[PDB]
Every structure is written in structure tokens, then in C-alpha cells.
């Protein structure tokens, strides 16, 4: 579309082919670009899970404050989300509405975990290294980039053995032992 003239813009104020109100600012596309999300529906599945969390938090808030049921369930939810890694802290109840985002879940995906662990320089590099078969979480090889890492499961995200990446880093430090297969 060419640039509208002045008299045309007044008659065509609402016209926009690229930004619609139902797009919600292309927040989904922004988040997928930040965390290299490949599947299109991943943001919306994550958003539905966040919506369940926020709906439950709203109901617990509408419960009376000095309710043992309310306090127990809010602490249960805070502990569960913190253990998964979605919540950075357990201090505030209000984080169950303010700090539950899609990006918070996407920061627990495997390439973001590797990039934070300095295993890969970019999230896209981490994605490619995952699909190329270099990454194991424990004994198990993970070639799915969408795999979500728990706080406990962070400690076993490591390079697979016989990896050219692992041999390269050992050879850089001059600590490569070929008996160990490197």
C-alpha cells in the first residue's frame, strides 16, 4: 500500500493490513523470535497453561485471606512452579498473576537453558546442536528443542560423549584423554 494522502487518511483511519487488534501486538511472534520457538502453536499452548495458573490464582484470591485452604493451595502452587523453574522466587503471592508469562516458561526450554549454561553462544546455535544429536539430559539423548528443563534436571544437561564439540573443548584446554573416548 502506498502512503495515504491527507484526505484519504481521514476517510481511512481504521485501515491497517499488518496490525489487527486480534493480533495483540504480535506478542506471540515477538516471544518466538526471542526464544527461537519453531512450532506456531507453542505460544498458545503455553498461554493456555498460564491462563489456568492465573484463573486458579484469581479464585484463591477471591477466597478469604485467613483461610487455611487458600494459604495451603497458594503455597503448593508457588512451590510447584518454583520447582519447575517458572517462578524465580517464592516470596509473593502476587507473582502468580504478575510473573507468570509465556516467556517464563520459554526460558525453561532446553536451548535457553544451554545458552544460559554457556554451552552454546546463541539460542539458535543451541537449537541446531540439539537437533544434531550433541545433547543429553542424564543418560538420555534429547533431540527435541521444546523439551522443558526442571531446576533439578539442570544439573544433568551435558554434552553427549563422543561429541565433536566435547572433543573440541577438551582439545582447547589440552585435556583430551582418548582412553575416556573424549
Amino acid at each position: 500500500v502506498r502512503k495515504l494522502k491527507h484526505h484519504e487518511q481521514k476517510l481511512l483511519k481504521k485501515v491497517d493490513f499488518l496490525e489487527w487488534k486480534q493480533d495483540q501486538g504480535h506478542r506471540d511472534t515477538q516471544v518466538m523470535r526471542t526464544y527461537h520457538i519453531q512450532n506456531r502453536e507453542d505460544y498458545h499452548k503455553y498461554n493456555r497453561i498460564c491462563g489456568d495458573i492465573r484463573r486458579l490464582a484469581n479464585k484463591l484470591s477471591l477466597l478469604p485471606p485467613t483461610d487455611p485452604f487458600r494459604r495451603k493451595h497458594e503455597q503448593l502452587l508457588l512451590d510447584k512452579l518454583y520447582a519447575m523453574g517458572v517462578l524465580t522466587t517464592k516470596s509473593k503471592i502476587s507473582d502468580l498473576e504478575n510473573k507468570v508469562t509465556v516467556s517464563a516458561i520459554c526460558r525453561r526450554r532446553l536451548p535457553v537453558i544451554m545458552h544460559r549454561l554457556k554451552m552454546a553462544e546463541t539460542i539458535q546455535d543451541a537449537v541446531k546442536f540439539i537437533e544434531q544429536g550433541h545433547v543429553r539430559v542424564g543418560p538420555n539423548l534429547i533431540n527435541d528443542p521444546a523439551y522443558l528443563v526442571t531446576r533439578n534436571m539442570e544439573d544433568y544437561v551435558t554434552w553427549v560423549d563422543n561429541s565433536k564439540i566435547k572433543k573440541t573443548l577438551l582439545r582447547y584446554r589440552n585435556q583430551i584423554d582418548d582412553f575416556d573416548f573424549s
Binding site: 499488518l18 504480535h26 511472534t29 515477538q30 523470535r33 527461537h36 520457538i37 519453531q38 541446531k128 537437533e131
Partner: protein
């Protein structure tokens, strides 16, 4: 062979020029006037030229001070009172309660002065005249315009106080 990390091409709202927000995307230090000493305007001399503001006329009428005669008594010198187009337009917008002020502004001893700006805002118009040329004396009783003229160096300020006009920042008036 296929590339790795394949993603679907979508709209990059940060960097697409078709969007309006991305579509939107020498040094000048003015010289100090040669009419001025450090705070003293030395080029100014009679006959002075007095840019009148609307409330100056209104307070002149309330205190029954003649405009030309009162200015001549205040300055002890001949003066040229100038009313700009925006000042006369403000007096005309003031309505039917101020037709006496309108007529006393229409008095032919007051010389008119054309304006080539949009809208009718006497404060910015007079301040722009002042910031350009140092030959004017600003007559006003508005507090904000008084503060602006006091911040501008080398510009005399006239006001209606009590029985007659009072001058300020003109060293010649003794």
C-alpha cells in the same frame, strides 16, 4: 540439504518498514547580541518601542492611566506603542465585555504591527520578537510573561502598578 533450526517467516514488528512506528524512523549556538553589555542593553535609546499585551490595556483602563501619556510619564521620553495582530485578536476574542478596551486599542496613536504566525498567542509572539531583536520594551502584567522577560537579558519591562506605570531593567529611567 535442509538447514537446521527452521522457523516460519512471520512479521518482525521491530524491523519492518511497512509498520508506522518503524516508518517514522550542524550545531547551532546563537550569537550573543552586540547590543548588549554583560546585562546592560546599550543600543536602546529614545524613542522607545513598547510592545503592549492585552492585560496591560485592561489594567490601564482599570487604573485610568492613558496609554501614550502614561508611557511618556513613565519613561520621560517619546515612545511608540505597538499592538500586534495576536494582541488585537485576543482583545477581540475577549468578547463584548471588553469593547472599551478594544476601542482604546484602536486609538491611532498606537501603531499596529503585523504577525505572520498561525494562531493567536501573544506570549510566544512577543517572546519571539524579544529573542530576535533587542529594541523592544515589553508592557505586561502577566506573571508568567513577566518571568520570561526577566529571564531574557537586555529587555525592559513595563507594568501597571498603583497610580502609574512602572519600568524595570531600564537603567536610563531615573
Amino acid at each position: 540439504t535442509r538447514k537446521f533450526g527452521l522457523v516460519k517467516r512471520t512479521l518482525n514488528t521491530k524491523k519492518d518498514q511497512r509498520l508506522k512506528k518503524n516508518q517514522e524512523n550542524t550545531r547551532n549556538i546563537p550569537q550573543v547580541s552586540s547590543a548588549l553589555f554583560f546585562q546592560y542593553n546599550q543600543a536602546i535609546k529614545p524613542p522607545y518601542q513598547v510592545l503592549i499585551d492585552t492585560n496591560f490595556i485592561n489594567f490601564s483602563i482599570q487604573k485610568k492611566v492613558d496609554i501614550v501619556r502614561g508611557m511618556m510619564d513613565c519613561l520621560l521620553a517619546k515612545c511608540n506603542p505597538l499592538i500586534t495582530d495576536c494582541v488585537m485578536a485576543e482583545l477581540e476574542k475577549l468578547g463584548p465585555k471588553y469593547r472599551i478596551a478594544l476601542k482604546l486599542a484602536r486609538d491611532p496613536r498606537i501603531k499596529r504591527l503585523s504577525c505572520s504566525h498561525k494562531g493567536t498567542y501573544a506570549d510566544d509572539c512577543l517572546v519571539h520578537r524579544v529573542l530576535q531583536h533587542k529594541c523592544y520594551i515589553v508592557a505586561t502584567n502577566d506573571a508568567g510573561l513577566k518571568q520570561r522577560i526577566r529571564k531574557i537579558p537586555g529587555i525592559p519591562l513595563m507594568s501597571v502598578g498603583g497610580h502609574a506605570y512602572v519600568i524595570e531593567k531600564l537603567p536610563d529611567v531615573f
